[PDB]
């Protein structure tokens, strides 16, 4: 109704190969007659849920998988229905990233991880550790250059260092991703954020460095190193910098742990072109020729399609992408990921600016992210409990609540508040419900 029928509108981030994708759209148009329009609006990961909630937006949305769980929970994405033959063409782990509540909600395209990118002319052997970067910066500053510049405004770029000694922020429990009790607040994360803030205090980095500033400095030969994903490689090729792409530096002997995003393509639930979207994604884009057209414009990283990934396997930059991906953490796709990112973004900005100490910044981020994630799991458990009818199951839930004493009885009901329960009681209800055969 609001979205035009008989054509496809695709949204993809401005840093990705939207011109290469438009070439795949011209191939679709040449074969089928259907026009494909590719757009890259600003802040599309936020603009998409705003317009799709009103039945508007693109037919197809491209973004890393982390945001798709939140879109699916709001009813914004159509369930995808590839057959076994198509599913067998992509790596099984890529399908896991786009599965939400038992259903596939997007087509996985590529596996993205940040790497350390360095200028071989300024730095033939890149540093293996973060600890050696302050003295390296001093040496390069005497020659008119800096050691490292990377986007400090987005938590995606600073998280690898924070999590190097901090470890993974999330864990899998009772059929769901849960943020750890100290996934953001631990001493290792505090050490990582302190190291980053100390780099700024010692004038080795600037708190206002953003994506454009870092990209221009590296591509103009002003800084020996940057941190970026595969999409950035084309702009460095154009600049003629002799670069290497390698493992991120270690911190306290621990590998840096980037969040691994699976660039994925979802179909808007309001689209009147769901079958055309499926044909374009399965038969045009997710082929060697389709992925090559996008890849030639801006590299995708380690693609989800087995056949084309084998043709990209010999690229040393992809081997580095995969090595960093293995050391990092696959992003969860739960709806609270939005709150997790807002909280870490705020902690890094406040620590780097002196608004808060490192300890206060991460303690507050842990509270904000864990409260939102826990609230979502409580809302879901409340929904789940309210549909149960079977006597044995209800008796056992009530038996578990009775052990705590956190309940009240009225003339007609047995009452309790999920918010007044301890997390161990909530975990026992979740564990019992997982065994009851009900969902």
């Amino acid at each position: 109704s609001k979205i035009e029928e008989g054509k496809l509108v695709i949204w993809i981030n401005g840093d990705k190969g939207y011109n290469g994708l438009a070439e795949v759209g011209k191939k679709f148009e040449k074969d089928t007659g259907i026009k494909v329009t590719v757009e890259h609006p600003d802040k599309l990961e936020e603009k998409f849920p705003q317009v799709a909630a009103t039945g508007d937006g693109p037919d197809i949305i491209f973004w890393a998988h982390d945001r798709f769980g939140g879109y699916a929970q709001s009813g914004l994405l159509a369930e995808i229905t590839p057959d076994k033959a198509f599913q067998d063409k992509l790596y099984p782990f890529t399908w896991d990233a786009v599965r939400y509540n038992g259903k596939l909600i997007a087509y996985p395209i590529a596996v993205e991880a940040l790497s350390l990118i360095y200028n071989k002319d300024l730095l033939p052997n890149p540093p293996k550790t973060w600890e050696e970067i302050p003295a390296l910066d001093k040496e390069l500053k005497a020659k008119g250059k800096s050691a490292l510049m990377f986007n400090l405004q987005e938590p995606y770029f600073t998280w690898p260092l924070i999590a190097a000694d901090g470890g993974y922020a999330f864990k899998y429990e009772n059929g769901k991703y849960d943020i750890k009790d100290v996934g953001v607040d631990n001493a290792g994360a505090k050490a990582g954020l302190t190291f980053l803030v100390d780099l700024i205090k010692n004038k080795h980095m600037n708190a206002d460095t953003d994506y454009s500033i870092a990209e221009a400095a590296f591509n103009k030969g002003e800084t020996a190193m940057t941190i970026n994903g595969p999409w950035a490689w084309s702009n460095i090729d154009t600049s003629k910098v002799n670069y290497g792409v390698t493992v991120l530096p270690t911190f306290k002997g621990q590998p840096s742990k980037p969040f691994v995003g699976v660039l994925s393509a979802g179909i808007n639930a309001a689209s009147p072109n769901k079958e055309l979207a499926k044909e374009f994604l399965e038969n045009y884009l997710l082929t060697d020729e389709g992925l090559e057209a996008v890849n030639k414009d801006k590299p995708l990283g380690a693609v989800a399609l087995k056949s084309y990934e084998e043709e990209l396997a010999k690229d040393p930059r992809i081997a580095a992408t995969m090595e960093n991906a293995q050391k990092g953490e696959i992003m969860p796709n739960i709806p609270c990921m939005s709150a997790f990112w807002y909280a870490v973004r705020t902690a890094v900005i406040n620590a780097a600016s002196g608004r808060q100490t490192v300890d206060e910044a991460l303690k507050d981020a842990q509270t904000a992210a864990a409260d939102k994630c826990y609230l979502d799991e409580l809302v879901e458990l409340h929904r789940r409990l309210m549909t149960l009818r079977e006597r044995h199951i209800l008796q056992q839930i009530v038996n578990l609540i009775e052990e705590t004493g956190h309940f009240h009885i009225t003339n007609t009901t047995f009452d309790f508040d999920l918010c007044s329960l301890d997390k161990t009681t909530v975990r026992k209800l979740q564990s019992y419900l997982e065994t009851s055969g009900t969902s």
């Binding site: 309210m386 209800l394 839930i397 007609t412 009901t413 047995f414 009452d415 309790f416 508040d417 999920l418």
Partner: peptide
């Protein structure tokens, strides 16, 4: 999040 079960 109050839950009510039939008594």
């Amino acid at each position: 999040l109050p839950v009510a079960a039939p008594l």
